[PDB]
């Protein structure tokens, strides 16, 4: 709420998925986005 919502969503992705995700301050269900790895 809203940074907390992003944090939780990203944590759930990291726990259960091997995909690369970043957070977004989305109000429309896109708190995370699958994107290419950033170095």
């Amino acid at each position: 709420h809203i940074a907390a919502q992003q944090k939780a969503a990203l944590q759930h992705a990291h726990a259960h998925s091997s995909g690369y995700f970043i957070t977004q301050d989305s109000a429309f269900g896109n708190l995370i986005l699958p994107v290419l790895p950033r170095l």
């Binding site: 969503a9 759930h12 992705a13 990291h14 259960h16 998925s17 091997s18 995909g19 690369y20 995700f21 970043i22 977004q24 989305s26 109000a27 429309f28 269900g29 896109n30 708190l31 995370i32 986005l33 699958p34 994107v35 290419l36 790895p37 950033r38 170095l39």
Partner: protein
Amino acid sequence: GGRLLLSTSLDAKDELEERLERCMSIVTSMTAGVSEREANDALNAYVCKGLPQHEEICLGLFTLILTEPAQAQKCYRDLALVSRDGMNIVLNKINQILMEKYLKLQDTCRTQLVWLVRELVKSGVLGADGVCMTFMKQIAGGDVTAKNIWLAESVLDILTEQREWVLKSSILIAMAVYTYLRLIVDHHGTAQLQALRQKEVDFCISLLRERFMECLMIGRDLVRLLQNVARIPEFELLWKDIIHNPQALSPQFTGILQLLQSRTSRKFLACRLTPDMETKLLFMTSRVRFGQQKRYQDWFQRQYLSTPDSQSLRCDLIRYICGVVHPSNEVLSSDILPRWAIIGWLLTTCTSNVAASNAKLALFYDWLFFSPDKDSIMNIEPAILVMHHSMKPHPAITATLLDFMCRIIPNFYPPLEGHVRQGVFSSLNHIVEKRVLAHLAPLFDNPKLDKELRAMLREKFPEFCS
């Protein structure tokens, strides 16, 4: 009750199984009560009388190999000796069994069939690479049942042990890499799965590093598979090489753009649906009337999409719907269930934010680097039509897709933001030029959409919001 297939009291007698049992009877009668040389003499004599006879003996020995493990080594030896067609007829029936019967194949026969395929590979039998590909197609995505996991590992062990042979076929390298990169995503949450995943990881990395230019034929969807496994340590390292040292993978590999601008062959998109999934999806997209889809969706959902492990399958289905299924104009103008409606359904079945996010990206994957000289209107039209048709009954779907489309542009890969913006711009222009949606303003500035979302759209694409 047959020995080849599982059958219930309810099940009709299988024609293929029936025929194979008769072939086996023909063989056993010519070999009963005799030596091993006398048997081979009679089989050889009979086979020479013609190819229907040759077929009966070859298939009879084949069926003995599948149903009688104690006799299989001898029967395989006898098969190799009498075969007059390089075992062509046997590989044909193997492919038919895999494509049509695998789900009903008895456990003993599955085990024997893997053993047999390993033998065919060792013998260097012509067409064995095609059999391996057909076998991989039966490994279901989003399925961690004991039987499916067993097959993933059994096929992998053949490919790993016979890697030198694998290297002889460029297309087999790419298909195996595509298949196993995808399966890796499902293989976690258990000791057995961890062991399997590590084997799959090492196998893919080795082919990717030793034969990158072969793997590169996959094209754009290879990036999608690689980002889905990016957090595994070996793939973090591979990604570092892809981004920082692409020449180390191959002097012909300039960088990620080259892959992203090359669209994926339908061969790869289709290999990640089992035959039953294809048959049911093709049926829904060709025979089911719009408005009559509920029970079919329920049936499919229950069989394929009702577990947490099954969520990963949705992306394969979406890419398939978008890149493989291109209905004719006749179908397109009729009242058949449209592709957008299937996509919409699949989106709503996501039970996790991860699966929903991956599904959205899969839906938009051909938009990102879209070029109208190469990519088809058919690949990008379901996304725009899901947005258009959802606006009235499910505005939240439209809103989430529009928000995703705006946010993916600077974020997918920041150094390529300009390319991604141009891809989405080109997709939208192509959609308008092809009259899929004659005007974008009624969508982008729809009164039902949140005004801050609409401000972001107008900021990103002012040329479309007037």
